[PDB]
Amino acid sequence: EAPKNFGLDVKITGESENDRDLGTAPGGTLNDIGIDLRPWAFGQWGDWSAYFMGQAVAATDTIETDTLQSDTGREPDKSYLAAREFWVDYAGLTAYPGEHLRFGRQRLREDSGQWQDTNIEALNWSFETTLLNAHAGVAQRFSEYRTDLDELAPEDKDRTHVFGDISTQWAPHHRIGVRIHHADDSGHLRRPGEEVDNLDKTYTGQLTWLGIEATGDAYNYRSSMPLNYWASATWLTGDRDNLTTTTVDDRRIATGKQSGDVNAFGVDLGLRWNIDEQWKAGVGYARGSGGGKDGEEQFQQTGLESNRSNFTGTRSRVHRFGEAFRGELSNLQAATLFGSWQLREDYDASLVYHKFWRVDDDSDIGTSGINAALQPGEKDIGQELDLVVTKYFSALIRFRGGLFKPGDAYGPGTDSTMHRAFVDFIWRF
Ligand SMILES: CCCCCCCC/C=C\CCCCCCCC(=O)OC[C@H](O)CO
Ligand SMILES: CCCCCCCCCCCC[N+](C)(C)[O-]
Ligand SMILES: CCCCCCCCCCCC[N+](C)(C)[O-]
Ligand code: NA
């Protein structure tokens, strides 16, 4: 019971992925295994505490051993070292032990995973009581802290994140709240005539997300309520200066840039039936605006998101928009069916169906686990069936599977079916 100062996380991960590009580019296939050692240290002295977690990975190929990876001077190696988290924490600001201030590289996380779920350098203030939850923090990436990555993602470079939220429990297990997030770019874009690589930035933006959120045990997998729900509306405002480019002799040259106001809208609705103590089923609809006058309605998430939550009502967390498609709520429309089952804390299982549309036929969608160009004039992105099965021993064995059936929007020459699967075996000392 003595508060544990250190431990080690072991994970054997094998991943099957075929094919990310829908057979348009050479290779790009995964069918590889790896191990991921994560030692962690923790100290606590009254109101003060400190924590470090490192990461050692060795794999047969650049497989994904971390759902919070920065997606890829930016070519990762099959094996690498990494400092995932390092932070100091003070909790003596108030007598509420749910209140604390955390400084360093830390796990920023909100329940839906659509606003922030990542490890990033930040100073975050958390205030979590029964009646009132409030968070405030500032974050920015200065490095990946890994032996195989030299540079930041262009989007992370010189981007500062400020964010805050406040919510109350107006009814037992019913939460209403507001959430704000601001992303500011201090970087520069390539001047006209300049060669632009893959690590130059697409744009520089001053973006602000204004969110309403109503939840009723939306991500509480032990809900005593027969019905759980999540509902959120988010307004994205600000401006973007997008870099315009042109190709001269198989190399892209900067041609200028255009400024433009962003006035987008994002909605995510969900209802989960608690049929009995084991079986649960539910429905979701999430829409990210896209297109509009000069792209003004192109919604986009914060860049810190993971879009992974326990929306299926299980202890295991599932990607909100498919483990294969991994859609970002951007120019995106999603209808989601899911059934889930769980036996105490020994097992949980989830079967999730998705269908994806575009909002605008000439506008690309946000990030995804699919690297295939979209046909102009076509909304039908495709369908996806997911299956997550987990057995908890601390330790756990988990299969995450996504089967993506591309729609008409991907067109000729593309594979009729793409899958991404994982078998995660985790052990805690
Ligand atoms: C307890 C709830 C908290 C308060 C929340 C109240 C506001 C939303 C309530 C129901 C929305 C249900 C909408 C059902 C799904 C909509 C499907 C849809 O709209 O897709 C068509 C699209 O708009 C293009 O045609
Ligand atoms: C190889 C350098 C990093 C490894 C640091 C040590 C790993 C953590 C050791 C804790 C082992 C867990 N336990 C409970 C058995 O002590
Ligand atoms: C969902 C199951 C995950 C499949 C894991 C398969 C591991 C096979 C590892 C063999 C590595 C050989 N090679 C050339 C592919 O790196
Ligand atoms: Na406290």
CA distance 41 to 85: 10
Peptide bond into 66 cis (omega under 30): no
CA distance 314 to 348: 6
List 173's β-bridge partners, or say none. none
Among the bound ligands, the one closest to the CA of 8? 2
Is 390:398 a contact under the CB 8 Å cutoff? yes
Residue 301, helix vs strand vs coil: coil
Q: How many CB atoms lie within 10 A of CB 226?
A: 10
Instruction: Give the burial string for 148-157 (b: 16+ CB within 10 Å, else e).
Output: bbeebbbbbb
Tokens, residue 306: 């993971």
CA distance 397 to 424: 6
Is 356:372 a contact under the CB 8 Å cutoff? no
Is 54:81 a contact under the CB 8 Å cutoff? yes
Which of 31, 323, 400 to mutate for ligand 3's pocket (most ligand atoms within 8 Å of CB)? 31
Q: How many CB atoms lie within 10 A of CB 204?
A: 21
Q: Which atom of ligand 3 is nearest to the CA of 422?
A: 1
Rg (the chain; Cα; Å) = 22
Q: Which helix (H) or strand (E) holds 385?
A: strand 380-392
- Residue 249 makes CB contacts below 8 A (sequence gap 6+) with none
- Ordered alpha helix ranges (H), 221-372: none
The one-letter amino acid code at 71 reads: D
CA nearest ligand 3 atom 8, residue? 32
Is 34:57 a contact under the CB 8 Å cutoff? yes
Between the CA of 123 and the centroid of ligand 2 the distance, in Å, is 27
> In residues, how long is the chain?
429
CA nearest ligand 2 atom 1, residue? 39
The one-letter amino acid code at 319 reads: H
Tokens, residue 375: 């046909």
Backbone angles phi, psi at 223, to 5 degrees: -65, 135
Is 244:277 a contact under the CB 8 Å cutoff? no
Tokens, residue 207: 């973006």
CA nearest ligand 3 atom 11, residue? 32
Greatest extent of the chain over all pairs of C-alpha atoms, in Å: 66
Is 127:144 a contact under the CB 8 Å cutoff? no
CA distance 152 to 70: 9
- CA quadruple 351, 355, 359, 361: dihedral sign: positive
What Å distances lie between residue 236 and 20, 233, 252, CA to CA? 29, 10, 30
Is 239:254 a contact under the CB 8 Å cutoff? no
* Helix, strand, coil percentages for the chain (3-state, nearest 5): 0, 55, 45
CA distance 67 to 55: 13
Tokens, residue 83: 């400092």
Between the CA of 145 and the centroid of ligand 2 the distance, in Å, is 20
Is 218:230 a contact under the CB 8 Å cutoff? yes
CA distance 322 to 253: 35
Please report, in angstroms and rounded to a whole number, the separation of the first and last CA atoms in the chain: 15
Q: What topology does CATH give the domain 1-429?
A: Porin (2.40.160)
Technique used to solve these coordinates = X-ray
Q: Which of 17, 82, 77 is nearest to 53 (CA)?
A: 82
Between the CA of 33 and the centroid of ligand 3 the distance, in Å, is 5
Between the CA of 256 and the centroid of ligand 3 the distance, in Å, is 45
Query: Residues 284, 285, 290, CA angle at the centre, nearest 5°?
Result: 150
Q: Which of 187, 191, 194 is nearest to 252 (CA)?
A: 194
Between the CA of 327 and the centroid of ligand 3 the distance, in Å, is 25
CA nearest ligand 1 atom 10, residue? 269
CB neighbour class for 25 (10 Å; exposed up to 12, middle 13-18, buried from 19): exposed
Between the CA of 40 and the centroid of ligand 2 the distance, in Å, is 8
Any ligand 2 atom below 6 A from CB of 339: no
Residue 171, helix vs strand vs coil: strand
CA distance 145 to 54: 10
> Where are the domains positioned within the chain?
1-429
Backbone angles phi, psi at 20, to 5 degrees: -60, -40
Query: Residues 232, 233, 238, CA angle at the centre, nearest 5°?
Result: 135
